[PDB]
A paper describes a structure:
The second type of rubber oxygenase has been named latex clearing protein (Lcp). K30 (LcpK30) and G. polyisoprenivorans VH2 (LcpVH2)23, 24 but recently iron was detected in an almost 1:1 stoichiometry in pure preparations of LcpK30 and of LcpRr, and both Lcps were identified as b-type cytochromes.
Here we report the three-dimensional structure of LcpK30 in a closed and in an open confirmation. His198 (F13) acts as the proximal axial ligand in LcpK30 and corresponds to His (F8) of GCSGsu according to the haemoglobin nomenclature. The transition to the closed state only bars one entrance to this tunnel, but concomitantly blocks access to the haem iron by reinstating Lys167 as a direct ligand to the metal, thus efficiently preventing the reaction of the enzyme with dioxygen. Although LcpK30 is an extracellular enzyme, this conformational switch may well represent a protective mechanism to avoid the generation of reactive oxygen species from the reduced haem cofactor in the absence of substrate molecules. These data confirm that the unusual Lys167 haem ligand stabilises the protein in the absence of substrate in the closed state. z = 3.06 is typical for a low spin haem (Fe3+, S = 1/2), presumably from the closed state of the enzyme with Lys167 completing the octahedral coordination of the metal ion.
Numbering used by the authors: 32 to 402
The structure:
């Protein structure tokens, strides 16, 4: 379901296509199911913990099927462009407060309105703790934008391959949780490529849309660079090129059809929201529940905020909406200091500390195959 078009708008650009709802990860899935079934997860995790850098040889002692899978998965696509990648990274850094806010509060809360992500995350067993699991898209979205992401001394190739490996492992594990099977609707196997592309629109497409709507200065070169970083990242995550949009016009159209209609409240999503709100409110950021609620509602809009169960705070939301664009125009250098209500500056400081504490200098545990 979800997806109804051909891939002529895609990175691969071809006329034909298989429905991404019924494609998973043909190279990773059986390699990980074997690694899990031979009881090699503890050992593979101790070995992979040593592999932290894009240019590093794989550690010896890996099982042969896994080594082969990994040396192939760490390859950059031939269409990756170094100059665009460096530019997309610079852009992400220069707009760091906006992109960090939008990933951590916008995309991270929107995830709790995406039923399959919420159920998979909620029921997933043996992986990261709940505290880390809930942050996982935002912190990966964040690290995607790093200056070094795809350079030899960076780590995003590492992060993407291990992430791809984790998704493969979950395809073999989640179906054995009766709780996930019973609530899955008709889906036999979790995390379709279609599902991955839903999350992608909740990240890349959403963030670009909101930055342009708020008046962040996004010239055409930067916008395409940011897209490219995201296209290379979808590929490195294991999304086939036939599903990755080629241009912003394609990404925007695909998001209206693939993301918008699947947003929905679930009990599992409700539970995830409370965890995320509690962790964010517990950071030493000054980001209280009222401020998170109002800003997340302004960002996501009222229909998504209602599904999520963020309560409408009409005064605070109106103050934000009337004045946040002035603050943005001021930080972008376009207007003199604006007379805005003082609480906007409070909000802005709370957001900056949030990016700092939750993402920038945040917790980065090693990405482990689940048990
Ligand atoms: C561009 C899309 C996505 C990104 C960037 C992403 C990122 C990540 C990362 C970084 C992890 C590792 C955290 C960890 O387990 O240590 C992970 C694990 C996982 N992801 Fe995703 N993911 C995406 C899509 C999906 C989708 C669509 C689903 C489900 C429908 C999903 C479900 C999970 C699950 C269940 C785990 C294991 C959670 C655990 O640790 O217990 N992800 N993801």
């Amino acid at each position: 379901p979800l997806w109804t078009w051909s891939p002529s708008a895609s990175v691969a650009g071809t006329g034909v296509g298989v429905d991404p709802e019924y494609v998973w990860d043909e190279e990773a899935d059986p390699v990980l199911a074997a690694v899990i079934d031979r009881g090699e997860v503890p050992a593979v995790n101790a070995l992979l913990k040593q592999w932290t850098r894009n240019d590093q040889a794989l550690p010896g002692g890996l099982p042969g099927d896994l080594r082969e899978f990994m040396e192939h998965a760490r390859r950059m696509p031939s269409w990756a462009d170094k100059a665009a990648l460096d530019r997309g990274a610079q852009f992400s850094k220069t707009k760091g407060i906006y992109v960090g806010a939008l990933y951590g509060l916008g995309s991270g809360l929107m995830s709790t309105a995406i039923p399959r992500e919420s159920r998979a995350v909620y029921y997933s067993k043996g992986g990261a703790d709940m505290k880390d699991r809930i942050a996982k898209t935002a912190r990966l979205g964040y690290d995607i934008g790093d200056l070094d992401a795809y350079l030899p001394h960076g780590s995003m190739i590492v992060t993407a391959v291990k992430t791809r490996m984790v998704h493969a492992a979950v395809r073999h594990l989640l179906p054995q949780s009766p709780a996930w099977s019973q609530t899955s609707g008709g889906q036999k196997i979790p995390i379709s490529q279609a599902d991955i592309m839903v999350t992608w629109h909740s990240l890349a497409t959403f963030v670009m849309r909101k930055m342009k709507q708020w008046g962040v200065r996004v010239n055409t070169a930067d916008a395409e660079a940011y897209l490219h970083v995201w296209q290379v990242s979808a590929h490195m995550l294991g999304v086939s090129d036939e599903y990755i949009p080629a241009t912003w016009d394609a990404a925007n159209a695909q998001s209206k059809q693939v993301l918008d209609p699947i947003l929905a409240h679930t009990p599992e999503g409700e539970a995830l929201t409370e965890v995320l709100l509690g962790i964010v409110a517990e950071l030493d950021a000054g980001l209280t529940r009222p401020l998170i609620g109002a800003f997340s509602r302004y960002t996501l809009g009222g229909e998504v905020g209602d599904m999520i169960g963020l309560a409408k705070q009409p005064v605070l939301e109106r103050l934000i909406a009337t004045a946040w664009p002035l603050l943005v125009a001021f930080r972008e250098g376009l207007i003199p200091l604006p007379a805005v209500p003082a609480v906007l500056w409070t909000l802005e400081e709370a957001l900056r500390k949030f990016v700092l504490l939750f993402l920038s200098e945040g917790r980065r545990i090693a990405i482990d195959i689940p048990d």
